[PDB]
Amino acid sequence: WNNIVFYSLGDVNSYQGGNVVITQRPQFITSWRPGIATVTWNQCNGPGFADGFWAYYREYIAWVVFPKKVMTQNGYPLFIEVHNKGSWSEENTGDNDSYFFLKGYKWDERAFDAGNLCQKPGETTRLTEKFDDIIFKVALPADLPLGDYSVKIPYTSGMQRHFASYLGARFKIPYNVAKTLPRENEMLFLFKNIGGCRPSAQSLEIKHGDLSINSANNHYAAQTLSVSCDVPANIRFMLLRNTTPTYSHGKKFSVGLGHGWDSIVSVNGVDTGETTMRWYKAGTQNLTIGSRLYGESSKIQPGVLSGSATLLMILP
Amino acid sequence: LLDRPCHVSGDSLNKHVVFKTRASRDFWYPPGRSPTESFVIRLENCHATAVGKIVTLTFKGTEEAALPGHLKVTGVNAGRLGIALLDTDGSSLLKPGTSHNKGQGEKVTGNSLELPFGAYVVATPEALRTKSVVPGDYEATATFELTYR
Amino acid sequence: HVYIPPCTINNGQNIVVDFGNINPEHVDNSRGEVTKTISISCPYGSLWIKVTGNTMGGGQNNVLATNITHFGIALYQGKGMSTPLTLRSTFTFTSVPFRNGSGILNGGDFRTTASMSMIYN
Amino acid sequence: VEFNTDVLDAADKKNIDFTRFSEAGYVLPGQYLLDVIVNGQSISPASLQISFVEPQSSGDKAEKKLPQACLTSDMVRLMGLTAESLDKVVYWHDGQCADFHGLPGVDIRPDTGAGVLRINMPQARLEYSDATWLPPSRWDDGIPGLMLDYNLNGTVSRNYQGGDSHQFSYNGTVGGNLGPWRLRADYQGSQEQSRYNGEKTTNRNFTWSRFYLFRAIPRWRANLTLGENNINSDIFRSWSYTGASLESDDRMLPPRLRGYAPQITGIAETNARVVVSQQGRVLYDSMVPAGPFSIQDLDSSVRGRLDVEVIEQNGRKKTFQVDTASVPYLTRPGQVRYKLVSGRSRGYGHETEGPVFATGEASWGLSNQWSLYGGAVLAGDYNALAAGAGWDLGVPGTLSADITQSVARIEGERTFQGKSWRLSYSKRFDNADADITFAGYRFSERNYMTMEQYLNARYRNDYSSREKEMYTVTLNKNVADWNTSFNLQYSRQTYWDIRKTDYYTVSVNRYFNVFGLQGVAVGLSASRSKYLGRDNDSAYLRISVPLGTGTASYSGSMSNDRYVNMAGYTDTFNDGLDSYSLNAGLNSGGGLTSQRQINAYYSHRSPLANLSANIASLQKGYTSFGVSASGGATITGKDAALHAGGMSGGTRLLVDTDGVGGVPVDGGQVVTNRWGTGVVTDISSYYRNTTSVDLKRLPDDVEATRSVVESALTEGAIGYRKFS
Amino acid sequence: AVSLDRTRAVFDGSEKSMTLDISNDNKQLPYLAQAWIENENQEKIITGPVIATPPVQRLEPGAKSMVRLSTTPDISKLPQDRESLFYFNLREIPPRSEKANVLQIALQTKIKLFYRPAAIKTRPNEVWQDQLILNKVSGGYRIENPTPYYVTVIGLGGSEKQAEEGEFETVMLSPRSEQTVKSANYNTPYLSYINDYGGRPVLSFICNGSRCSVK
């Protein structure tokens, strides 16, 4: 048999992040505090009490789960990535709403202790265990306004107990019931922003007048955008795909406009889609987004152009 | 067809009748006469009382010094044979260069107008008294001029 | 789309019905209908042709007016006077003068302007 | 037949000996006003007058003369006749008859009654010269002058917090042609002009993207471009270069020989005429001679099959089917296509240099549907020799191969050897219309590389993503009575020892009508990025129903917790002087954030310069009032002009006059300004462009006598057309 | 038959040449349209002010052809304030027969040409006969012309029907001269005249005593 009893931590910590720019990464230490804990999930199908007259073996697996994406007051996601692995054992990187921490350090121990095997949710206990820390880096997104911020990341840090009946029982908790836990822990950290790298336009509209289709070929439609900052970095440009390309033109990242009429998008003369530019000194750079609508395979299709082009700035 | 009034149409374009003449039987006795033939020329889209307003027809040709009023014949009898053209009444001789008399003789057949013309050969009296007419092929040309107002 | 395209009209040439010089008084059952064949270059049909202009009195609806009275120019589609047209590929229309009445006619030489409205889908 | 000589029209002798011609088409001399045609099509309007004098120089015993039209040198210079191959038209004096008996197969029919003089000539040394595409033998070059073409913008940025600032994105592409050589230089990049507040940005931008000099060479049929340019994606990836580049463009050839198609074979015995219709349209109809006939007049924009039937002098016809390839890089057999670039390689900035560059590429078309191509990169430290062939098998599909050995030595002691392969497949029109237009089999090894690794730093942290086997089927099927062209695509990007990513999508564009007019186009798609966890989907829904003066549309998409929609209700109006648009919307940021937004547009294409106004927004309900203007000017030519449509700097004609206030030119409605010069810019390349006058909207002070005229721009040239 | 396109020939002094199409309606035998020029006093003239392009030319049956006329400097040296009269003629000749006593039939249609100079050129809608004066003479009527254009009157009546039906002799009159034609007395004269193209309008007049003016 395998009964699962969960009990989550109850600590609140504060930290001052200081003055930041968007491409630099403010380091943060996730210190562990052996404090109070609260039991939140119980299941009982076996015995309840034990006096310690039978040989009983125990197991321990820790669980600290925080989401990478987090809802803010203004609606934009924080794409936070893991910087270092340490002495860990990484498994299941395919999830996008939760990362998963598990640690096994002690095994093969038989006890002669009397206790409570199936615990009620209303109890608090004493905790004394010291281990290694975690280091945290926060990746700022493409769009962020200035001012002061009070962003709250919800995180459930806990510590459960695994008791079974036979030697060699390696069992794990299923993923669909692990994300249903309540919001216990909070963290009051503050950030100050003077404003870093942000595009001035943020619209990306492509329209013009009208002419016949006999001179529609080798057309031009450009709109530029200015990016400004004050810290030397290595910026990377990536155009996110929203629509579907009609016909194959090879390696060219084409943006579809609908009805079987796509458009070749040339970022500053070179038809590549993704580029690489580094910073040198104070000033600014520009991204001229020109576009050729040459997508006719000898068949005209009259349809109103209402496409879009979503931009995002991935930082290395 | 209503375009180009008093015109010659496509059906009646080439009139050709061959004269059956022999010298000794017609140009040897003084009365110089052979039988006279009739000529038919129809003018489409022309009116009966309005004939003189639109068109007048005159004959063109070279005048003969010994016989006034007829058409030139060439060949072996140049100046010996004459062609007298008859009017619609069949009696008055129309001299070349003189205009046609409007009125009598015309036939209003439908939208067209019928004009009965004549063609006739007359021998020279000096050639009749001296019997100088030689039998053989004779050639002559005729050109009718219509003077439109 | 955003582009309402004009395809072509007789490869950018001027359109003139050369009739020579004929008189406006004729018989209304057979006339000098000079056949004109105008081609239209398509890029790849979805097209209709509408001809407009000023008209005269009566119940007839197939003649455009001129600058002087008692003569007009009538239009019909294709070879043969059976079907008239209500006022890559090709379309044929012939211009011929048609007259239903006699009387006084003041003027013989003419020039006309015909407006062809091309409405696209 | 014989006639009457004795009628005597003139009493005096006119002495032109009127009796011998009773049974050759002798028109006696004078003058005429007919036009000129070659093999059925016209060349110039009926305004030219070529005379004809009688050949008195021909001394014979039969004393017979034939009046041929004594053609003068300037009209033969524009008739389409070549001058380098036949040196017999260059030695006659203008008074004598320029004879035509020396070249074979030419009979002349000089009919002065109908006035057209139809002349046939053989199909081996001709310029066809139809309605468009004038021949290269007659060229009016550009006048010495400068020219610019702008597109301005500008907005206000009102946010809920912090402060306000403005932006002024003013670019510029100047151009100056003095004779044939023209410099296309971009004097402005991007700019910025801000407002004053407590927080300043005040950043002035400057760069220069592309400066190049270019001129087309009509003798060897190429266009050399010296300066900054880009190469196409044939085999290698694209990168900006600097130096000369003898590139064969597609705009310099005629539109009816535009594109690739296989030529037709066959044996004739007499002069037949091939007429062909694919499903109802007649494209070419002309006479072809006997023997092994092979006409190369058109390989136009038609995908596949056509039924070649020939009709000789009695009427019996034979039919046989031909197959087409439709692969994106095949060429015409018997012609050359090449890419000869040289110079130096460019970097990231404008002031960044690199190693010496020299890259040659060409193509060779042999008979019986055979084709060669090949890349030759001869450098001091990089040798990538390419070679390949292309085949048309017919019914199972088409094949192509690419053998390429790239050897190079980097300076950090690294021996580089690498082998890459690529196969291309295609399929013709089936009964259910299924067409695989492109199918790549690009194969890469562990040791293949591109030029991009050495110009950057020594550490690169990425080799390439395109590493192993790929297969890309693109089927497009059309079913009758539904008008639906649904297409599916499947891509394959590869990784090494960690999980592979597979892109594969399905789309469908159906056609139906419920309570409205016909013209409704509605689409649906289903895209999905595959890996073992997180099957990420992508589906967009877009409906477009027109009402003439309005188009109700909602283009909504949903990939992952991001759903939108629109409420557009605008289209164009009756006469065409202005154009507007307006749209609504709502975004979804995943974590319960969903609020409205508004986008609109306000333009009016004025003939002096076209301009627009734009109000836009985003997620947290902002307001961005803008004004945008576009068009250009031609300063310091013979006279100045300002216009409103240009694809690049060039390809437009400027009609000139004197003492006029304003006259609109058809096809773009550009009126002239106060000095009286108008220039139309929304036109095409290498075609016979005609500009006329609008008789229904002119004021009652001016009069136009000469409407129809002709001009000749290749690309980037300015014409010269004065009308009285 | 030699079908002539319109009923008159008009050519401009500022133009160098104009074209006039001819067309034969025969179906089997070919004819030839020969063109030559005579002046006002019926003498043959090959030189002079008008130079003729086609003196002898043939056209096949069911076809059409043309006759163009051009200028010599003698048309420049004559006075340009008034018109002059001369005429171009065209006859068809049929093929000769082999038989004897053959009368060949040749036909021609005579239409007059009027030279309009560039200084006194008229617009196509102009009714230039809106200024003529009418004078009552006893026994007939005197044609007086204050304009430099030609005037040929073949009709004068009390109504339209008597003007087009009534017998009247055709006469031609030179500019700035006069001649008498015999006619009866009428209170309100309606005059018949000929235009440039062949249409048939009628003019209405009002008489004030013995001198009349155009209404």
Author numbering:
A (entry chain G): 21 to 336
B (entry chain K): 9 to 157
C (entry chain F): 9 to 52, 55 to 97, 115 to 148
D (entry chain C): 35 to 758
E (entry chain D): 1 to 215
Could you give the paper's own sentences about this structure?
In the CU pathway, a dedicated chaperone facilitates the folding of pilus subunits in the periplasm and an integral outer membrane (OM) protein termed the usher provides the assembly platform and secretion channel for the pilus fiber. Periplasmic chaperone–subunit complexes are then recruited to the OM usher (PapC for P pili, FimD for type 1 pili) for subunit assembly into pili and secretion of the pilus fiber to the cell surface. Ushers contain five domains: a central 24-stranded ß-barrel domain that inserts into the OM to form the secretion channel, an internal plug domain that forms the channel gate, a periplasmic N-terminal domain (NTD) that functions in subunit recruitment, and two tandem periplasmic C-terminal domains (CTD1 and CTD2) that function in pilus assembly and secretion. Using cryo-electron microscopy (EM), we determined structures of the activated PapC usher in the process of secreting two- and three-subunit P pilus assembly intermediates.
To generate a three-subunit intermediate, we replaced the PapK NTE with the NTE from PapE (PapKE-NTE) and deleted papE, resulting in a ∆E P pilus tip fiber composed of PapK bound to PapF bound to PapG. For the three-subunit ∆E dataset, starting with 537,038 particles, after 2D and 3D classifications, we derived one 3D map, named Conformer I at 7.6 Å. The ∆E cryo-EM structure (Conformer I) represents a P pilus assembly intermediate consisting of the PapC usher, PapD chaperone, and three polymerized pilus subunits: the PapG adhesin, with its pilin domain translocating through the PapC β-barrel channel and its lectin domain exposed on the extracellular side; and PapF and PapK, which are located on the periplasmic side of the usher. PapK is bound to the PapD chaperone via DSC, and PapK is also linked (by its engineered PapE NTE) to PapF via DSE. PapF in turn is engaged in DSE with the pilin domain of PapG. In the Conformer I ∆E structure, the PapD chaperone and associated PapK subunit are held on the periplasmic side of the PapC usher by the N-terminal tail region of the usher NTD. Notably, PapC CTD2 is not resolved in the ∆E structure, indicating that this usher domain is released from the bound chaperone-tip complex and flexible. Therefore, Conformer I likely represents the stage just after a newly recruited chaperone–subunit complex (PapDK), still bound at the usher NTD, has undergone DSE with the previously recruited chaperone–subunit complex (PapDF) bound at the usher CTDs. Comparison with the ∆E Conformer I shows that as the third subunit is polymerized from below, PapG moves upward (outward) by 41 Å while rotating by 85°, which is equivalent to approximately 2° rotation per 1 Å advance. Notably, as the PapG lectin domain emerges from the usher chamber, it bends back by 60° toward the pilin domain such that the two lobes of PapG are now nearly orthogonal to each other.
